[PDB]
């Protein structure tokens, strides 16, 4: 497993509603927000072998 | 730990001192595979687990 636990993508800017569609942030979110798409990028050891 | 002991590498071209002027050094020419930053793009086992 990685030491940081994630290798994610940069910018999200979570959003707020207006009618039928969502628009953009309304004094909540920043350009910075981080989640990793899919799972944590790992690697493999066969340690008993 | 990765094989080379480096994140990847970056360029960091060579510069000597000209006495208040920073001129590029001849001896430390264009692209030596220099230091990267920080520390190594390393990972984590729980090996006893």
In whole angstroms, the N-to-C terminal distance of chain A is 19 Å
Question: Using DSSP, what is the number of strands of chain A?
Answer: 2
Shape label of chain A: elongated
Walk across the major sheet of chain A and give the strand order.
1-2
Helical proportion of chain A, percent range: under 10%
Protein name (chains A, B): Hexon protein
Family (chains A, B): Belongs to the adenoviridae hexon protein family.
Subcellular location (chains A, B): Host nucleus; Virion
Main attributes of the structure:
part of a larger assembly, 49 residues, 2 chains, mainly beta, 14% strand
Structure description:
- The structure is cut from a larger assembly and holds two copies of chain A (49 residues).
- Chain A is mainly beta.
- The first copy, chain A, has no helices and two strands.
- The first copy, chain A, has strands at residues 16-18, 21-24.
- In chain A, strands 1-2 form a two-stranded antiparallel ribbon.
- Chain A starts with 15 loop residues before the first strand and ends in a 25-residue tail after the last strand.
- Chains A and B meet through loops of A and loops of B.
- The PDB classes it as virus.
- The entry lists the keywords Adenovirus, virus.
- HAdV-F41 Capsid.
- Chains A, B: Hexon protein.
Short description:
By secondary structure, chain A is mainly β. Chain A has no helices and two strands. Chains A, B: This is Hexon protein.
């Amino acid at each position: 497993f990685p030491l940081g636990g994630s290798a994610a993508t940069d910018t999200y800017s979570g959003i707020k509603a207006n009618g039928q569609t969502w628009t953009a942030d309304d004094n909540y979110a920043d350009r910075g927000a981080e989640i990793e798409s899919g799972n944590i990028f790992a690697m493999e050891i066969n340690l008993a072998a």
